[PDB]
Design a protein around this ligand. Structure first.
Ligand SMILES: C[C@@H](Nc1nc2c(cnn2C2CCCC2)c(=O)[nH]1)c1ccc(Cl)cc1
Ligand SMILES: C[C@H](Nc1nc2c(cnn2C2CCCC2)c(=O)[nH]1)c1ccc(Cl)cc1
Ligand SMILES: [Mg+2]
Ligand SMILES: [Mg+2]
Ligand SMILES: [Zn+2]
Ligand SMILES: [Zn+2]
Lengths: 326, 322
């Protein structure tokens, strides 16, 4: 017969390995089954004796702890994990990384924006929120995401690590913390600089080199929307701006500072994306390409096309503005 | 009692001050005096009644641990106060820096639970999970400090402009987080690097000096006269043995240095004085030579005395073996 949606077809299973996967086609249950499959498919269930039922419960609790923000929601979580999954296959990461490292990457990706409130660190700090006070202005959101991740994993019915020895858990915990804290965009230039420094002579034996690579990998997946095919990427920009404009409106309403790049009166879809693609995305992916040359064709290529497309869209926008004042 | 005599007010400026004489209310009075005396009430328009409520609230948020209690908080703040005079810190530091040093010293162990970071992390406590194994205690003390200051009737900074508040907040956070002894060798190395060519106008150099100062004050019990210092060691062991007892009956690792069956008063202090305190104050002395006679001197005497005590302890164990 026709099988229910939460039973994934073999065509989906195949497409899921690839950064072209249409993240918009699927509802929560289907995405949850996708994530479940990734853990089996990567041999993490096997190698860490993950109780398959616990794995399902864990993913449900994770889902429940993402909020319905326009951008930072469960689907974003899914995108980031699915891109990590894609990159494992694209870059043959199982040749370079231990199974513990693959587990860290994947689990960090799923958990990295848990309970995001839809207002970024600058709002937290300037508004002196409970979170900013709790974390002393030090990456309040990312600290909170990581805290919630391990609150969940401490509930015995969600503890996918229950059959891992304590030493393994400590290693996994520390790695996940490093990775989730690395997603604070305030630290972007710092982290890129450290990574570029190691790239002068990269060493897969060197644990510090590998820690930085993993930080770069999760950072890549986190902001990877523009790597996806245009029709998959475009809607995310509207989601982003909806969330960002919600924050700038609120900051105006409360007399707090407003960042120009988030201002509803100054931002267009094109200006939101151009500099971000050219100066954040492209250079980051360029450095990764040096270790994984296959990344150029699969991920740099769509970024170049998206850059050109948004640059053209800005010319059109500018000409249209000029026309109504000439 | 509530009113401090002139003798007390005077004695308060020196590291010989007998911290054990006084009850909470008099200690509160001493701390209040320090804020007036240092010019902090004047220069930051601190409301005089708010200052007293703030101190009362602070006191309320210290717990009755054997060691990490309100009197420890008083000792650290009183030693900071003493170092301001000894080292003439008001010639080197702005009043904003003095306020940061003093306020951080008062707040730096707020709501300490009586079990250190190693316990928090190994036992996967609520605090360790909240703070991701990153200096959980020190992050907590800091959070509680600004929860207190967020209460309007406790807000001694309510008349500082926002820019000033942010500067103070950042400074206090840095200093309180710097008290995590896990970072001791790191912070010492950073400071000794700057001490290669120290520069009072370099903000990065001054941040490290302030971190070293609050650190000096936090672990300064043994600088005090023997009769004042010795009882702190009993308190220390009492608190630490509590933890190692608990770690043993929960199956968690126990550090030999806190092991009730392995530790003596003397073995707890000799190594600490020799390889932690003395070297730290030696580096500080290079900036402030007056520190040598007032602070390194008692450390040398304490070291020698505990090494003598150890010989008797050892002789006693020779009479007990079988
Ligand atoms: C306007 C915004 N553009 C943008 N921001 C993006 C994207 C993906 N993730 N992010 C942000 C969301 C939180 C942080 C990364 C994206 O595709 N575009 C933007 C954000 C930061 C900078 Cl530095 C410049 C532009
Ligand atoms: C090595 C350490 N000794 C020690 N530790 C001290 C002192 C003052 N503060 N502290 C520690 C309390 C945590 C910041 C260091 C002190 O005078 N001696 C120690 C030995 C045995 C036990 Cl049981 C506990 C501590
Ligand atoms: Mg985030
Ligand atoms: Mg402390
Ligand atoms: Zn994210
Ligand atoms: Zn202390």
């Amino acid at each position: 017969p026709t099988y229910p949606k939460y039973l994934l077809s073999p065509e989906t299973i195949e497409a899921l390995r690839k950064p072209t996967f249409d993240v918009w086609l699927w509802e929560p249950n289907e995405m949850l089954s996708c994530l479940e499959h990734m853990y089996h498919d990567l041999g993490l269930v096997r190698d860490f004796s993950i109780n398959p039922v616990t794995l399902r419960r864990w993913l449900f609790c994770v889902h429940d702890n993402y909020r319905n923000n326009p951008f930072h929601n469960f689907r974003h979580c899914f995108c980031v994990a699915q891109m990590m999954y894609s990159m494992v296959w694209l870059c043959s990461l199982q040749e370079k990384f231990s199974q513990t490292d693959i587990l860290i990457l994947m689990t960090a990706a799923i958990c990295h924006d848990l309970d995001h409130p839809g207002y970024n660190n600058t709002y937290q700090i300037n508004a002196r929120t409970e979170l900013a006070v709790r974390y002393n202005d030090i990456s309040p959101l990312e600290n909170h995401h990581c805290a919630v991740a391990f609150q969940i994993l401490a509930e015995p019915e969600c503890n996918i690590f229950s059959n891992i020895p304590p030493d393994g858990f400590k290693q996994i915990r520390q790695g996940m913390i490093t990775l989730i804290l690395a997603t604070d965009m305030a630290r972007h230039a710092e982290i890129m600089d450290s990574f570029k420094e190691k790239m002068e002579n990269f060493d897969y034996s060197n644990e510090e080199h590998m820690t930085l690579l993993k930080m770069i990998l999760i950072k890549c997946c986190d902001i990877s929307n523009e790597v996806r095919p245009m029709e998959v990427a475009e809607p995310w920009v509207d989601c982003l701006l909806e969330e960002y404009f919600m924050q700038s409106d609120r900051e105006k309403s409360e007399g707090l500072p407003v960042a120009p790049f988030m201002d509803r009166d100054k931002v267009t879809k094109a200006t939101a994306q151009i500099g971000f693609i050219k100066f954040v995305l492209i250079p980051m992916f360029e450095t990764v390409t040096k270790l994984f040359p296959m990344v150029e064709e699969i991920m740099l290529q769509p970024l170049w096309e998206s850059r050109d497309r948004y640059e053209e869209l800005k010319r059109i926008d500018d000409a249209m503005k000029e026309l109504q004042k000439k």
